[PDB]
Amino acid sequence: MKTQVAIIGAGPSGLLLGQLLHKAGIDNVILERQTPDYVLGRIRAGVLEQGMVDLLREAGVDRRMARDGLVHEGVEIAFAGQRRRIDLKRLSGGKTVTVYGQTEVTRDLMEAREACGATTVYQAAEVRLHDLQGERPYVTFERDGERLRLDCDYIAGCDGFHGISRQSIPAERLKVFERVYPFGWLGLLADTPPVSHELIYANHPRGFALCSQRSATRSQYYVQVPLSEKVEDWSDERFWTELKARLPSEVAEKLVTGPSLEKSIAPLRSFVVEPMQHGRLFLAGDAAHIVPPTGAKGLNLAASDVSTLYRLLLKAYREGRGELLERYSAICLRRIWKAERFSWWMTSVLHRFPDTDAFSQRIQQTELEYYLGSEAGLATIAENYVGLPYEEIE
Amino acid sequence: MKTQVAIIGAGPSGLLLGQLLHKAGIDNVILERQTPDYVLGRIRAGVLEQGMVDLLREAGVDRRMARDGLVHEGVEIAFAGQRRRIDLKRLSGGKTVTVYGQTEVTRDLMEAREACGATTVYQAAEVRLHDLQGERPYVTFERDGERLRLDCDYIAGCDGFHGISRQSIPAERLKVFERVYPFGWLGLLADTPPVSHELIYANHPRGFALCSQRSATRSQYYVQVPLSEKVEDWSDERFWTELKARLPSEVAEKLVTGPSLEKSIAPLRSFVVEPMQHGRLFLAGDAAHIVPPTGAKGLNLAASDVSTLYRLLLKAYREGRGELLERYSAICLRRIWKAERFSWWMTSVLHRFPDTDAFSQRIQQTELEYYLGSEAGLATIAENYVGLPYEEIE
Numbered sequence: 001m002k003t004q005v006a007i008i009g010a011g012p013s014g015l016l017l018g019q020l021l022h023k024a025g026i027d028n029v030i031l032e033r034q035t036p037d038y039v040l041g042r043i044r045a046g047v048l049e050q051g052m053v054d055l056l057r058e059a060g061v062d063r064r065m066a067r068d069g070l071v072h073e074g075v076e077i078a079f080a081g082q083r084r085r086i087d088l089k090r091l092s093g094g095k096t097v098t099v100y101g102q103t104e105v106t107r108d109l110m111e112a113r114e115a116c117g118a119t120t121v122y123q124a125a126e127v128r129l130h131d132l133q134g135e136r137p138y139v140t141f142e143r144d145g146e147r148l149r150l151d152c153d154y155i156a157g158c159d160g161f162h163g164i165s166r167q168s169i170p171a172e173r174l175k176v177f178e179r180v181y182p183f184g185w186l187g188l189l190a191d192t193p194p195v196s197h198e199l200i201y202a203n204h205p206r207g208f209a210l211c212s213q214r215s216a217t218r219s220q221y222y223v224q225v226p227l228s229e230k231v232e233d234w235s236d237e238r239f240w241t242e243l244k245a246r247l248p249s250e251v252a253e254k255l256v257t258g259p260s261l262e263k264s265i266a267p268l269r270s271f272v273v274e275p276m277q278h279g280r281l282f283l284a285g286d287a288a289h290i291v292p293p294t295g296a297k298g299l300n301l302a303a304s305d306v307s308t309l310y311r312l313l314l315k316a317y318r319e320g321r322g323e324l325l326e327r328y329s330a331i332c333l334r335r336i337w338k339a340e341r342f343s344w345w346m347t348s349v350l351h352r353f354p355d356t357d358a359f360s361q362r363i364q365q366t367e368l369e370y371y372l373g374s375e376a377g378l379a380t381i382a383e384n385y386v387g388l389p390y391e392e393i394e
Numbered sequence: 395m396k397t398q399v400a401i402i403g404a405g406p407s408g409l410l411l412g413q414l415l416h417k418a419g420i421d422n423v424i425l426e427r428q429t430p431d432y433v434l435g436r437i438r439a440g441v442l443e444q445g446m447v448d449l450l451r452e453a454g455v456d457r458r459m460a461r462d463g464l465v466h467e468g469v470e471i472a473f474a475g476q477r478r479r480i481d482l483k484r485l486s487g488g489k490t491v492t493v494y495g496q497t498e499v500t501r502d503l504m505e506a507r508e509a510c511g512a513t514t515v516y517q518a519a520e521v522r523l524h525d526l527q528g529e530r531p532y533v534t535f536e537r538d539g540e541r542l543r544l545d546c547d548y549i550a551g552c553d554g555f556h557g558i559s560r561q562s563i564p565a566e567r568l569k570v571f572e573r574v575y576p577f578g579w580l581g582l583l584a585d586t587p588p589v590s591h592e593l594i595y596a597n598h599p600r601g602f603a604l605c606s607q608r609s610a611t612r613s614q615y616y617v618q619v620p621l622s623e624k625v626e627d628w629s630d631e632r633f634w635t636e637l638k639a640r641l642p643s644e645v646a647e648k649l650v651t652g653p654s655l656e657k658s659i660a661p662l663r664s665f666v667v668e669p670m671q672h673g674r675l676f677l678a679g680d681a682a683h684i685v686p687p688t689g690a691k692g693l694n695l696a697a698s699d700v701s702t703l704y705r706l707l708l709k710a711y712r713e714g715r716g717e718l719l720e721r722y723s724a725i726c727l728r729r730i731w732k733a734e735r736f737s738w739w740m741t742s743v744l745h746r747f748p749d750t751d752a753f754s755q756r757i758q759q760t761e762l763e764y765y766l767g768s769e770a771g772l773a774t775i776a777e778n779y780v781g782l783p784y785e786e787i788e
């Protein structure tokens with residue numbers, strides 16, 4: 001096979017990059033290790049930044065989102081028995097966020113790519129990258145019992161955290177930054193109407209809780225739990241009782257509960273690699289970084305990494321400004337670090353950390369009080385939550 | 395589940411460690427991501443050092459090897475149209491090597507573990523390590539549609555180069571050393587009688603070639619080829635013709651050729667991580683290092699890593715000398731580096747490297763001439779080939 005941009009991974013990052021390149025007339029091929037149904041079987045949430053919403057529209061894959069997505073003009077943080085609303089729209093000047101799951105976005109992108117006949121090779125086993133520092137890099141993989149070669153000009157590693165792309169870069173060139181939080185999130189998805197039209201992030205002595213939604217009849221809730229917790233020890237009844245205990249009475253009081261459609265515990269961690277490229281290989285999305293779910297920035301960083309790569313690739317192909325690609329990592333990292341910082345801040349002020357002393361507890365309560373009670377403070381939250389402005393490049 | 399030593403990986407390293415611990419009465423459980431047939435489907439060669447042969451006997455899994463294995467008292471290196479024999483037995487004082495494939499060794503270990511009822515969980519998906527720096531580390535994984543927890547005292551990461559164990563150690567604690575050679579090995583396995591009763595490593599202007607064997611009616615041959623070569627462009631006829639062109643006439647002349655049972659190109663690379671442990675987790679085999687096939691040290695290092703870990707675990711459990719486990723990496727690395735060095739030397743003197751000048755070519759020919767023409771030189775080769783003596787520990 002032969003293309004211009006080889007793409008490893010058919011998750012959100014790879015599909016979005018591929019659809020953007022497709023519309024731009026830049027040849028591209030996506031190689032995915034799993035099957036279509038396997039990828040779609042991954043149930044993942046999503047709170048889309050304005051930048052991502054705009055990118056999906058630019059990619060021509062927004063019809064479903066415009067119909068099934070939930071546009072939120074604000075978000076609330078609860079603590080000390082009170083609900084504090086952050087007016088994202090007002091504070092940002094018009095920006096909002098859209099609650100539409102990664103799973104749905106992935107589904108939409110796959111239907112769009114399948115419809116236009118773009119190239120996607122599923123069940124591409126043993127993917128391997130070659131001659132990355134040359135002008136003719138290529139990829140090899142096995143399919144239907146045969147080895148194939150894919151020649152290209154560039155390679156976009158969009159293969160996630162456990163992909164092969166990040167592992168294909170000499171360890172000497174990379175620097176890893178990481179942190180694991182001392183707790184996980186026990187989530188419960190149910191066919192019940194949400195308790196609020198907007199999300200509710202709750203800080204409570206017993207621990208963090210979050211009220212989210214999927215539709216008028218489907219809701220998603222979470223409560224923080226220690227690392228060693230087993231989902232088996234958490235019946236729906238126990239979850240509902242603990243969730244209510246961490247929410248203001250007025251909220252817990254009007255909460256509609258019911259059987260769970262799915263329950264699971266997920267850890268919270270951060271990870272960033274520098275740089276995010278090597279020769280003709282460029283990493284994007286989870287292949288380069290991880291963030292905790294608190295700020296819902298994972299899916300959004302995948303989008304911003306792709307946007308940047310796409311725009312630089314355009315400059316290379318249409319302006320012969322290929323040297324600009326050298327700036328890919330520096331640009332993405334500035335945004336990734338700010339997202340990691342905001343995600344870290346949100347995690348720090350909303351959760352109960354083990355072995356915390358009285359002073360720390362008071363500092364945390366004061367952080368919430370100050371930020372939610374100041375216009376400047378509220379602004380820092382709002383501008384970060386809807387997503388900081390994309391860097392124009394150059 | 396609950397055991398004393400949790401083992402990740404049911405390849406040679408994990409199975410051997412597990413069988414050794416089984417006989418010692420130390421509880422152990424092996425978690426393997428793939429199925430039994432998948433593991434056995436990996437066709438891998440093997441030239442066993444005396445130390446490994448002794449270890450398999452100690453493990454009580456040597457009957458098949460004693461019957462089907464080929465004991466070699468010497469090995470030959472050909473160059474400049476002449477065959478030079480290295481009398482391993484004489485030079486080492488009695489040590490030899492046994493040609494018996496990794497695949498056969500793995501098969502033997504699996505039959506032995508299955509027979510004694512030791513615990514092995516195949517298709518163990520999403521393996522994850524936990525609380526490595528505590529006194530109660532544990533592992534989690536999914537099976538038959540359910541999440542399970544395995545408590546233990548120690549964890550042996552025997553999950554290979556692309557395993558999760560090495561990736562479970564903070565990047566800040568690790569230092570990676572690596573090298574990729576500018577060529578690969580095109581191998582051809584056939585049901586033909588070998589051209590020699592001992593191996594023949596050949597250095598020739600056109601490139602490296604190797605004559606090996608599996609039995610009186612089965613042979614394995616290799617010729618070096620550039621990185622970008624496709625096995626598809628190499629018919630059996632072309633392989634046989636190139637192989638002969640790289641061997642002394644007397645050898646090429648008596649070579650029996652025939653249809654290949656299997657053909658493939660494999661790269662040559664080296665990789666070492668320091669340290670090889672973190673808390674209660676200890677890496678062994680490919681999970682910690684890779685060596686080129688030239689010295690056939692890959693399988694042997696897996697064995698020596700296991701031997702060391704096993705002996706240290708014994709000291710911990712039977713002598714309460716658990717502090718000795720702290721020395722695991724230092725001990726293994728001394729042997730790993732010497733094996734990497736010898737493997738590197740063998741690779742350097744036997745292959746044709748791209749863009750080599752006249753001086754390099756002459757230095758290489760002189761290396762062979764000196765080492766094969768000196769008793770001290772021959773000794774350095776012999777002692778390394780049969781395997782240096784295992785470090786006694788402490």
Ligand SMILES: Cc1cc2nc3c(=O)[nH]c(=O)nc-3n(C[C@H](O)[C@H](O)[C@H](O)COP(=O)(O)OP(=O)(O)OC[C@H]3O[C@@H](n4cnc5c(N)ncnc54)[C@H](O)[C@@H]3O)c2cc1C
Pocket residue numbers: 008009010011012013014031032033034039044045046047102124127158159160161162163164165266284285286287293296297298299300302
């Ligand atoms: C339990 C959990 C909950 C999360 N919740 C949130 C949330 O609430 N909000 C949010 O924004 N983010 C959340 N995230 C993060 C978010 O899902 C990711 O940031 C997003 O999946 C990144 O997309 P990606 O395409 O970069 O990577 P992925 O979605 O991982 O896609 C990568 C693709 O590459 C393929 N691949 C891997 N290796 C290879 C290979 N060798 N060859 C070929 N293909 C390969 C994979 O099969 C996969 O399809 C969560 C993550 C987890 C684990």
Ligand SMILES: Cc1cc2nc3c(=O)[nH]c(=O)nc-3n(C[C@H](O)[C@H](O)[C@H](O)COP(=O)(O)OP(=O)(O)OC[C@H]3O[C@@H](n4cnc5c(N)ncnc54)[C@H](O)[C@@H]3O)c2cc1C
Pocket residue numbers: 402403404405406407408425426427428433438439440441496518521552553554555556557558559660678679680681687690691692693694696
């Ligand atoms: C093409 C090729 C040719 C080679 N030729 C030679 C040769 O001629 N001579 C020589 O000595 N060596 C050779 N080697 C090297 C040799 O095969 C290895 O050194 C040996 O396989 C190492 O054994 P191991 O048990 O440490 O790892 P492996 O054999 O890789 O076994 C690791 C096991 O862990 C499992 N695993 C991986 N990830 C997970 C996870 N997340 N959870 C659970 N289980 C997991 C794997 O499925 C596997 O079964 C060759 C290698 C290759 C690739």
Ligand SMILES: O=S([O-])[O-]
Pocket residue numbers: 035036122123
């Ligand atoms: O199921 S598929 O398209 O390989």
Ligand SMILES: O=S([O-])[O-]
Pocket residue numbers: 429430516517
């Ligand atoms: O095929 S098995 O034993 O999981």
